[PDB]
Write a protein that binds this ligand. Structure first.
Ligand SMILES: Cc1cc2nc3c(=O)[nH]c(=O)nc-3n(C[C@H](O)[C@H](O)[C@H](O)COP(=O)(O)O)c2cc1C
Ligand SMILES: O=[N+]([O-])/C=C/c1ccccc1O
Length: 363
């Protein structure tokens, strides 16, 4: 029997199905101000039949910015714009979480406050690219700037920025928040020994490496409620040159046991980047499942059939689809009916306007 189209309690909200829209950076916000737009509102409204929409990654602060065109949730103007977007999703009977990030070293000095180097756990270049805008406003890929290591006394400010962004998110009408602790961004930069060479209380042992993300979790649970908080992790494998170190499984299980103590709404596991990699072992999935007592969302080149299999095995609760949600606003109906999926147009994933954004048809 199919379970994808059955309801699921996700902390404080109830999803009517298990087909979630993964967080998808689309880089269509207004500059100056990193302001969401009515076009973005239309895009999200089109996808409101998702069991849960998880927004594009959204800055907690101006310092958090690493991509031209990515929205923020730190300014009054951003709060006002997001309020209209969440109202539109709710008018269509949807549910929407905001994914909150700090990009850390995956950034460029030209888009940082004061034109300064971005920050990270350690002063190590990401050795990758980010997306800026050229003089005509078009997306361009540019090598990342070498970061400055955060001073110990700057850490409380980072925690406060997450806390403040969650206050703002609650005000803006989001149903949940997802902390971006994956994919080589700031929280993951602290988690991974490959990017964290600190020798203070925020590096070294796994307890120290997870310290920042757990302080953030505690701060945001206190600001709102634990049943409003999810977290995305990518703790097995390599993502944007950030591996998970030489004890990745044990370190992941430590973090997950710690997260379970807070009673948070969900754990969202990004299992692979677009280039793929070794699948999660069923033993690992079992170890995660016995340790965490909230919703588990799986993501990364899923099919509906794989999601059904893992839901049936009692190992995950929901699936997040990324690219299929870019191209199929009514992905839920298509998967329910076994309809074909619209052809994807990758050239318009990042930047631009309505074309390749709001022009993918429903059935
Ligand atoms: C254009 C694009 C933007 C993405 N932006 C984000 C993001 O903002 N936050 C995030 O955690 N993952 C991001 N991802 C990863 C997706 O959430 C998803 O995990 C990935 O695309 C693999 O799932 P899929 O095979 O269903 O597309 C992005 C992926 C794509 C293709
Ligand atoms: O893992 N991915 O295939 C993409 C990740 C991603 C892409 C753009 C912005 C934030 C992200 O986490």
């Amino acid at each position: 029997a199919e379970k994808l189209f059955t309801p699921l309690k996700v902390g404080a909200v109830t999803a009517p199905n298990r087909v979630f829209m993964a967080p998808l950076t689309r880089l269509r916000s207004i500059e100056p101000g990193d302001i969401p737009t009515p076009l973005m509102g239309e895009y999200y409204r089109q996808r409101a039949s998702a069991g849960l929409i998880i927004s594009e990654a959204t800055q907690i602060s101006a310092q958090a910015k690493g991509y031209a065109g990515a929205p923020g949730l730190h300014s009054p103007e951003q709060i006002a714009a997001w309020k209209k977007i969440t109202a539109g999703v709710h008018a269509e009977d949807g549910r929407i979480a905001v994914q909150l990030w700090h990009t850390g070293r995956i950034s460029h000095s030209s888009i940082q406050p004061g034109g300064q180097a971005p920050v990270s756990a350690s002063a190590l270049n990401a050795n990758t690219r980010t997306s800026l805008r050229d003089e005509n406003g078009n997306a361009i890929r540019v090598d990342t700037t070498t970061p400055r290591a955060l001073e110990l006394d700057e850490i409380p400010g980072i925690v406060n920025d997450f806390r403040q962004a969650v206050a703002n998110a609650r005000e803006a009408g989001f149903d949940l928040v997802e902390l971006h602790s994956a994919h080589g961004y700031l929280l993951h930069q602290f988690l991974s020994p490959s990017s964290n060479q600190r020798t203070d209380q925020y590096g070294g042992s796994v307890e120290n490496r997870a310290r920042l993300v757990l302080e953030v979790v505690d701060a945001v649970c206190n600001e709102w409620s634990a049943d409003r908080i999810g977290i995305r992790v990518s703790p097995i494998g390599t993502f944007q040159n950030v591996d998970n170190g030489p004890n990745e499984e044990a370190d992941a299980l430590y973090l997950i046991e710690e997260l379970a103590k807070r009673g948070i709404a969900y754990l969202h596991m990004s299992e692979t980047d677009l280039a793929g990699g070794k699948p999660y072992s069923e033993a690992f999935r079992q170890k995660v499942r016995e340790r965490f007592h909230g919703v588990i969302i799986g993501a990364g080149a899923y099919t509906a059939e794989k999601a059904e299999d893992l839901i049936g095995k009692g190992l995950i609760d929901a699936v997040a689809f990324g690219r299929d949600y870019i191209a199929n606003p009514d992905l839920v109906a298509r998967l329910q009916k076994k309809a074909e999926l619209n052809p994807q147009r990758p050239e318009s994933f990042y930047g631009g306007g309505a074309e390749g954004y709001t022009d993918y048809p429903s059935l």
